[PDB]
Design a protein around this ligand. Structure first.
Ligand SMILES: CC[C@@H](C)n1ncn(-c2ccc(N3CCN(c4ccc(OC[C@H]5CO[C@](Cn6cncn6)(c6ccc(Cl)cc6Cl)O5)cc4)CC3)cc2)c1=O
Ligand code: HEM
Ligand SMILES: [Cl-]
Ligand SMILES: [Cl-]
Length: 506
């Protein structure tokens, strides 16, 4: 190092920028000597790790890692080490892990707690979240869906009429960007049914911008830096307070009038948000919980109906097959749609089921390791402070589980023990290769709402329109895996025409 100082400046600079790369390469060579750790995927760039391949093609990244290291491998991701366990055995290891070994709230809270607010979901012990899930299910019964279906349909028909994306009472055909239309239709239908009429109407005012601001705070870049003094972090914090304050205001007005019925999720939480220990949720916490429930249905559902429309755009045979089922179940379109009719549209539901296979909206689910965990039938130990990463969406796309996994075939769906974590009996095992809604204690409680919402929506699209791509030979767009959910690359335009030009919608 006395030789170093004699070198020309450009060399001394080269050596000094090279030093971090040599140090991390050296540290990875020393790391591979531990046989009690999963293989660490090799990476060139200090700290960044494998962010680029993982962030842009996670399933292809996983597949190449699998061929080289097996089902269990670690990778460096923006200063954090993620341990992946691919396949059914991984579903079981992670989704069914013990509370003492891994924590979802420790992995997610710095991202969700500023968006939803304090005291609920991931800003509370797990046993409280189990009971919050039980409360919310009180508004997700069959009887609730019976009520929701005509409200969701009414919202969709208003949208067809009023939205500049359609204006369907004046145009017989059009081009629409499903990445514009579907997020909007999703928030209108979920508002009207879960928050009710008062809150749905506020979306016709400038209040709607607050939801947009709240959404902007909900990006994966908040996983790494949950708080910067940035403008859009400020707008997010304002929105959470303005929105939750508005829900509390509505909650209070209802309590004064005793206007507490069986209409929406606000009614349900006002009547049934008392924990087993006799304590109960505050209005601020009810409002924060409402924010989280709506947000959990927003991106997953909008992404999914966008993919349905796109896969059907290139399949007029499937559109026609679904249209035939619609005419059988709804008596040639003389019966108003009801929840029982959706339960009798098997092909419609297989179409949603198949879209969710091809496009799981959440490609990666995470838990933080809370104490060293041995991995059964390996020599690996995953140490405290790593993260484990489970990816059912990877298994959806695997030839071993689904022959010709990239083909959209709704007829592949032609056709154990239970455990109660506190929100109802669910499947005890999670070894299925197909888990669009997760499994174990953190499993989705919105699955039937999603089928209800998506089912009304696709039922009405099929009965009202035919559509295709605007250019011949165009196909399904590629996915963008960098956002909250995997969603199609925008814009994603389809050409539609009314099946009944004379029909007026409202
Ligand atoms: C620098 C290069 C660049 C290309 N790059 N480098 C890295 N990345 C990247 C990394 C990771 C990701 N991922 C990982 C995180 N992921 C994600 C994982 C889980 C998740 O949510 C799980 C929890 C929290 O939110 C919900 C979602 N939900 C559940 N049911 C329906 N939605 C949730 C649960 C309950 C409630 Cl009430 C609300 C919500 Cl939102 O569950 C959201 C996003 C998004 C993509 C994206 C990009 C990049 O883009
Ligand atoms: C097609 C639509 C949807 C899909 C694919 C989906 C998927 C998922 C998945 C994979 C999880 C587990 C997350 C994990 O294990 O880390 C989950 C959890 C959850 N989702 Fe959904 N979801 C959808 C719609 C909805 C809707 C409509 C709601 C509410 C109305 C909702 C609310 C929730 C809640 C409350 C949880 C519990 C989180 C926990 O217990 O930690 N989701 N969802
Ligand atoms: Cl009109
Ligand atoms: Cl459930």
């Amino acid at each position: 190092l006395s030789y170093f100082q004699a070198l020309p400046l450009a060399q001394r600079v080269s050596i000094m920028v090279a030093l971090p790369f040599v140090y991390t390469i050296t540290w990875q060579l020393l790391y591979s000597l531990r046989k009690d750790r999963p293989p660490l995927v090799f990476y060139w760039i200090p700290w960044v790790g494998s962010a680029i391949p993982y962030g842009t093609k996670p399933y292809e990244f996983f597949e190449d890692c699998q061929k080289k290291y097996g089902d269990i491998f670690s990778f460096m991701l923006l200063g954090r080490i993620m341990t992946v366990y691919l396949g059914p055995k991984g579903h079981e290891f992670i989704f069914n892990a013990k509370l003492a070994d891994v924590s979802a709230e420790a992995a997610y809270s710095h991202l969700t707690t500023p968006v939803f607010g304090k005291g609920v979901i991931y800003d509370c012990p797990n046993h409280r979240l189990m009971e919050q899930k039980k409360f919310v299910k009180g508004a997700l019964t069959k009887e609730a869906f019976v009520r929701y279906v005509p409200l969701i349909a009414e919202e969709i028909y208003k949208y067809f009429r009023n939205s500049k994306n359609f204006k369907i009472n004046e145009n017989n055909s059009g081009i629409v960007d499903v990445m514009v239309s579907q997020p909007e239709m999703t928030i209108f239908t979920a508002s009207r049914s879960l928050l009710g009429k008062e809150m749905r109407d506020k979306l016709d005012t400038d209040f709607a911008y607050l939801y947009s601001d709240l959404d902007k705070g909900f990006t994966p870049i908040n996983f790494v830096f949950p708080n910067l003094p940035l403008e859009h972090y400020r707008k997010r914090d304002h929105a959470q307070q303005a929105i939750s304050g508005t829900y509390m205001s509505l909650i209070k007005e209802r309590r004064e009038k005793n206007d507490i019925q069986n209409r929406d999720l606000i009614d349900e939480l006002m009547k049934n948000s008392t924990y087993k220990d006799g304590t109960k949720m505050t209005d601020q916490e009810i409002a924060n919980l409402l924010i989280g429930v709506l947000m959990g249905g927003q991106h997953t559902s909008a992404a999914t109906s966008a993919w349905c429309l796109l896969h059907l755009a290139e399949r007029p045979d499937v559109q026609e097959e679904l249209y035939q089922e619609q005419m059988r179940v709804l008596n040639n379109d003389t019966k108003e749609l009801t929840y029982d009719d959706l339960q009798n549209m098997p092909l419609l539901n297989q179409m949603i089921k198949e879209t969710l296979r091809l496009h799981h909206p959440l490609h990666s689910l995470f838990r933080k390791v809370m104490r060293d965990v041995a991995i059964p039938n390996t020599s690996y130990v995953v140490p405290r402070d790593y993260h484990v990463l489970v990816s059912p969406g990877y298994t959806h796309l695997q030839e071993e589980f689904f022959p010709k996994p990239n083909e959209f075939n709704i007829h592949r769906w032609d056709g154990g023990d239970e455990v109660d974590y506190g929100f109802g009996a669910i499947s005890k095992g999670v070894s299925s290769p197909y888990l669009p809604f997760g499994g174990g204690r953190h499993r989705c409680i919105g699955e039937l709402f999603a089928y209800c919402q998506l089912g009304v929506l696709m039922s009405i699209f099929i009965r009202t329109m035919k559509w295709r791509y605007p250019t011949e030979g165009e196909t399904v767009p590629p996915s963008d895996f960098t956002s909250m959910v995997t969603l199609p690359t925008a814009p994603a335009k389809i050409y539609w025409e009314k099946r009944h030009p004379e029909q007026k919608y409202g």
